[PDB]
Amino acid sequence: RTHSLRYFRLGVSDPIGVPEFISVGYVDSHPITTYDSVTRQKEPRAPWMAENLAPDHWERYTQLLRGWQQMFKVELKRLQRHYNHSGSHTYQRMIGCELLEDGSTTGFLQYAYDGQDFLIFNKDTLSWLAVDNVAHTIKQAWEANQHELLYQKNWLEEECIAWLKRFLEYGKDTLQRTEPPLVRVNRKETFPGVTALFCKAHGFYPPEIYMTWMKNGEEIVQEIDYGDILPSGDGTYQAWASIELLYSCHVEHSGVHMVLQV
Amino acid sequence: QNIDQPTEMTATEGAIVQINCTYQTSGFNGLFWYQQHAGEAPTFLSYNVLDGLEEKGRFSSFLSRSKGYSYLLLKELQMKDSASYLCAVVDSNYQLIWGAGTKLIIKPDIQNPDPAVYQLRDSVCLFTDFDSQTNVSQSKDSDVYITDKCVLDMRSMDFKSNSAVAWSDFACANAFNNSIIPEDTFFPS
Amino acid sequence: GVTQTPKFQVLKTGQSMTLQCAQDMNHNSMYWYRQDPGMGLRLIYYSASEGTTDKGEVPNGYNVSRLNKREFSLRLESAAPSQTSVYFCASSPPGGTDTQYFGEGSRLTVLEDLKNVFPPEVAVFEPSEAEISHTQKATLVCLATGFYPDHVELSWWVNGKEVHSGVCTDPQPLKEQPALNDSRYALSSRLRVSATFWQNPRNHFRCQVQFYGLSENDEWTQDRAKPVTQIVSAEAWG
Amino acid sequence: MIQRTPKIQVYSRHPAENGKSNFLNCYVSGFHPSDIEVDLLKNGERIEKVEHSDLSFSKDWSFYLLYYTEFTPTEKDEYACRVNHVTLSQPKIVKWDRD
Ligand code: NA
C-alpha cells in the first residue's frame, strides 16, 4: 500500500497565543511528532512512536529543532528584507518521501512564503525551481553549495525511506489495518421531476476510497458530485458521490470492489 | 556504531597510498576526511555522501554507500603529507562518529646512503645518513638515552636524511650496539 | 577562526579550570572534544545554538556554558588525573553537509602535586669536524632534558629568524626514568646546514625551548626555584 | 498576500437518528494563515465539553482542524459550528444539515 513520511515547518514573523515556530511530522494522515517554540521540546504525537523510540531520540531532536528554529527565524528575516515586507508573514517547509505499492519511491522538498510556493527541489537534476526573482536569488545561493544538494538527494532517496519503513513497523497495527466501508444508496425526489441518488460510505480505513456511478454498466456522461473524504473522529473515514436523473454505485477500497445496483 | 581504519601506514615519497575506512552505522548522512599534523588541530580534507570518486589535486576520496566503505587516496607523496588522517561519519541523528585515525609515515628515498656515527661537543653520538630500511633500537642501559630515527629535509638542495641521537664508560663506537646498523657504517677515530 | 585558551595548563588534583573558546564566523553549533591516544575524538558537550547545550559521549566531570553566539566555555569542577588530555573546541556553520572548524587545542595535565614539575636544561652540540670533511654538511644537535610535564615547544633560530628547513625534532619525548610513573623527559632536535654556512663566523644559531609550567597565581613553598612558564635557550656561532 | 478562508463541514460520526448517541464533528480546512477560533454550539450556546485535534498541515500549505463532541440528536435541538479567522468580518455560524 502507498505510504509516506513528511516533516512540516511553520515560521511566523511578529505573531499574535500563536507560536513563532512549529514543526510536525506525519506518517500518512497520522501526526507522529511535534515541536514548537513555546514548549521547546520535540514530543511524540502517536503512542506507537512513544513506545518505540527511547528518550535519547527525543533529547537529540529537541536540540536539533532548537537550532533549526533559530535558522528559520533568520531565513524569514532575510526573505522579508528581499521583498521589502513589514509586519507578520509566514514561511513554510515540507520535506518527505513516498513508498509506493509497486516498490518505487518519490522524494520531495519545498518551501512557501505567505502560503504560496516559493522554491521546489528537483532531486533528479539537483536544482531548485524559483517562482519569482527573490526565490531566484535564494536558489543561486543554495545551488552554489553542491555538497548540500547531494546531501538532500541522499536523504530523500535513502534516509527518509529507511525512517518510513521503521515507523511503518512501529505503527503496523494502526497503519497497515483495513476497515472496510459500510455503503448505502439513498433515493429521493428533490425538485419536481428531479431524482437525486446518493452513494454514501463510512467506517473505512485507510481514507483512500474510489466511488463512482455507472449507467447500464457504462461510465456516466452527466456530472457526478463528489463529497470529501472526511475523518469521522474514531480513526475511520466517510465519503459520498451523487447524481441526478438502470444506475449502480461502484466502490473500490483496499483491493475489494463493491456494486450497489438501484 | 563503529568506524574502522588502520592505526598506521607507511609508504615511500613520490609513491601512492590508499587509506581505507569502513563504517557500520544505523543511518548515513555523509563521510568526512580530516588531516591532523602532530601537535596541531584537525582540518577538513573532503566530504562524500553519494557514490563516486572526488578528486582535489593530489588527494582523492572515494565512497561506496552499499559497501559502507570509503578511501582517501594520496598520490605523488611528499614528506609534508606525514600526519594523521581522520575518518568521520554522520549517522541517522546527524551526529559525527569519529574514527581513531591513521598515522601516515612517509619513508624518504635516500639515493646515496652514507651511514656514519659522529661525536659532538657542547656529550652526544649522532647516527646519520643511513637508508630508510634501517631501524634504531632503544637503550639497553639505564644511564644511556637513544631517540628514534628522524627525517630532515634540506629544501635548498633536494637533500633528505635520517638520524638518531645517543647520549650519556660511554663511547660512539658502542652507542648503537643494540641496533642493527649497516656493515659499512663509517666510524671516525 | 576559532580561538581556544589556554594552549597548556598544569593543574593540581581538585583544582578548578575553565577552557575558553570563541569564534567570529557566525556559527550556531559549538563542540567540546577530548582527544586521547588510540581513540577517536570524544564529544563531551555541544551547543546546537545559542540558548541550548547538551551532553556528548563523556560529560562526567565537566559542565559548559554557551555564554553568547561567539563563546562556549568548558569547566572542570574538580580536576582529576583522568582529565589529563588534549581538548578541542570546534564550531560549524548553520546546517549542511557542513564541516567543523577546530581551535588549536588545549593540553591539560592533572597532577597529585606540583613537586616534580621542572623546566628543561637546554644544550647545543656543535657539528663533528669528521662529518664536515666526509659529507660537506654540518649537524647541530639540541637537547632539552629533565623537564616535567611534557609541555615544551622547541624551535631553531638562525640569525634571529625561525627555520624549518634542515630541522628535525622528535615527535615524542623520551622518558629519562622509564620505570617511574612520574619520569622526567628528554627531547632532541637536529639542524643541518652546509659546511660553508656553518664555517661563516657571523652566522648565529639558537635552540629555543618554550616550557609551560606554573603561573604567578600558583602557590610555591619548596626550596628550589618556582618552575614557571619560561624560555630556556642555548646558542652557537659558526 | 493571498489569504484563504476556511471550509467548514459539520457532520456526524455515524448516520444520525433522533434519540441515538453520536458524535458531532466540525472539520475546518483550507485556511491560511493559521490563527483560527472554533466553537461548537447547541441552540446558539457554546458547548463546554469539546475535543479537538492539534493544528494540522496540508501539502497545499493551508491548515485543517477537527472539533468534535458527544451528542444525542433531537428534532428540537439545533447544532452549529462558529468559526473566526482574519478573512472573516464577523464569526461565521455554520448550521448542521441534520444528515
Ligand atoms: Na557534567
Among the partner residues C48, C97, C98, nearest to A67 by beta-carbon distance: C48
Span B109-189: which CATH code? 2.60.40.10
Are residue C119 and residue C229 in the same domain, yes or no?
yes
Are residue A101 and residue A2 in the same domain, yes or no?
yes
Q: How many CB atoms lie within 10 A of CB B56?
A: 10
- Which residue is listed with cell 556504531? B1
* Residues contacting C125, CB < 8 A, separation 6+: B120, B121, B122, B123, B124, C140, C141, C142, C143
Among A177, A201, A229, where does a domain finish? A177
| Phi-psi label, residue C123: left if phi above 0, alpha if psi -120 to 50, beta otherwise | beta
- For chain D, domain boundaries: 1-99
What phi, psi does B98 have (nearest 5°)?
A: -95, 135
Taking the centre of ligand 1 as the mean of its atom positions, its distance from the CA of residue A54, in whole angstroms, is 21
Among C112, C131, C147, where does a domain finish? C112
Residues lining ion ligand 1 (Cβ < 5 A) are C 59, 63
Say whether residue D86 is in contact with chain A using an 8 A CB cutoff. Answer: no
**C-alpha cell belonging to residue A78:** 532575510
**C-alpha cell belonging to residue D38:** 472554533
Q: Do A66 and C29 touch (CB under 8 A)?
A: no
**How many angstroms away from the CA of C173 is the closest CA of chain B?**
8
Residues of chain B contacting A57 with CB distance shorter than 8 Å: 93
- Which residue is listed with cell 527525543? A58
Residues of chain B contacting C126 with CB distance shorter than 8 Å: 120-122
Among C83, C112, C141, where does a domain finish? C112
* Residues contacting B119, CB < 8 A, separation 6+: B125, B126, B172, C128, C130
What does the alpha-carbon distance between residue A249 and residue A186 come to, in Å, rounded to a whole number?
11
The dihedral through the CA atoms of C207, C208, C213, C219 has a sign that is: positive
Among A177, A202, A236, where does a domain finish? A177
Beta strand pairing call for C29-35 and C85-92 = antiparallel
Radius of gyration (Cα) for chain C, nearest Å? 22
Element (H, E) at A50: helix A47-50
Identify the residue among C26, C28, C31, C49 best suited for mutation to test binding to A, counting A beta carbons within 10 A and taking the highest: C49
Q: Which residues constitute the domain of residue A229?
A: 178-262
Say whether residue A71 is in contact with chain C using an 8 A CB cutoff. Answer: yes
Q: Using alpha carbons, select from A19, A5, A39, A25 the residue that is nearest to residue A90.
A: A19
Element (H, E) at D81: strand D79-84
For chain A, the maximum distance between any two Cα atoms, rounded to a whole number of angstroms, is 68
D57 and A90 Cβ atoms separated by less than 8 Å: no
Element (H, E) at A137: helix A133-143
Resolution (A): 2.5
Packed helices A55-83 and A133-143: angle between N→C axes, nearest 10 degrees: 130
Are residue C23 and residue C82 in the same domain, yes or no?
yes
Go through B150-168 and write b for each residue having 16 or more CB atoms within 10 A of its CB, e for each that does not: bbbbbeeeebbbbbbbbbb
* Residues contacting A6, CB < 8 A, separation 6+: A25, A26, A94, A95, A96, D59
What does the alpha-carbon distance between residue B105 and residue A189 come to, in Å, rounded to a whole number?
93
- Which residue is listed with cell 455560524? D93
Q: Which residues constitute the domain of residue C169?
A: 113-238
- For chain B, domain boundaries: 1-108, 109-189
CATH number, position A58: 3.30.500.10
**How many angstroms away from the CA of D50 is the closest CA of chain A?**
12
Distance of CA C94 to the CA centre of its chain: 31
Are residue C42 and residue C25 in the same domain, yes or no?
yes
Span B1-108: which CATH code? 2.60.40.10
Distance of CA C5 to the CA centre of its chain: 12
Are residue A97 and residue A130 in the same domain, yes or no?
yes
**C-alpha cell belonging to residue A197:** 441518488
Are residue A16 and residue A118 in the same domain, yes or no?
yes
What does the alpha-carbon distance between residue D14 and residue A65 come to, in Å, rounded to a whole number?
40
Beta strand pairing call for B102-107 and B8-12 = parallel
Please report, in range form, the residues annotated as the binding site of A for 2-amino-4-oxopteridine-6-carbaldehyde.
Answer: 42
C144 and C210 Cβ atoms separated by less than 8 Å: no
A185 and A260 Cβ atoms separated by less than 8 Å: yes
- Tell me how many domains chain C contains: 2
Length of chain B: 189
Which residues numbered 108-147 in A keep a CB inside 8 Å of some CB on B? 147
Beta strand pairing call for C85-92 and C2-5 = unpaired
Span D1-99: which CATH code? 2.60.40.10
Burial environment of residue C183 by CB neighbours within 10 A (0 to 12, 13 to 18, 19 or more): middle
**C-alpha cell belonging to residue C127:** 657539528
Which residues numbered 6-65 in C keep a CB inside 8 Å of some CB on A? 28-29, 46, 48-52, 54
| DSSP assigned state of D95 | E
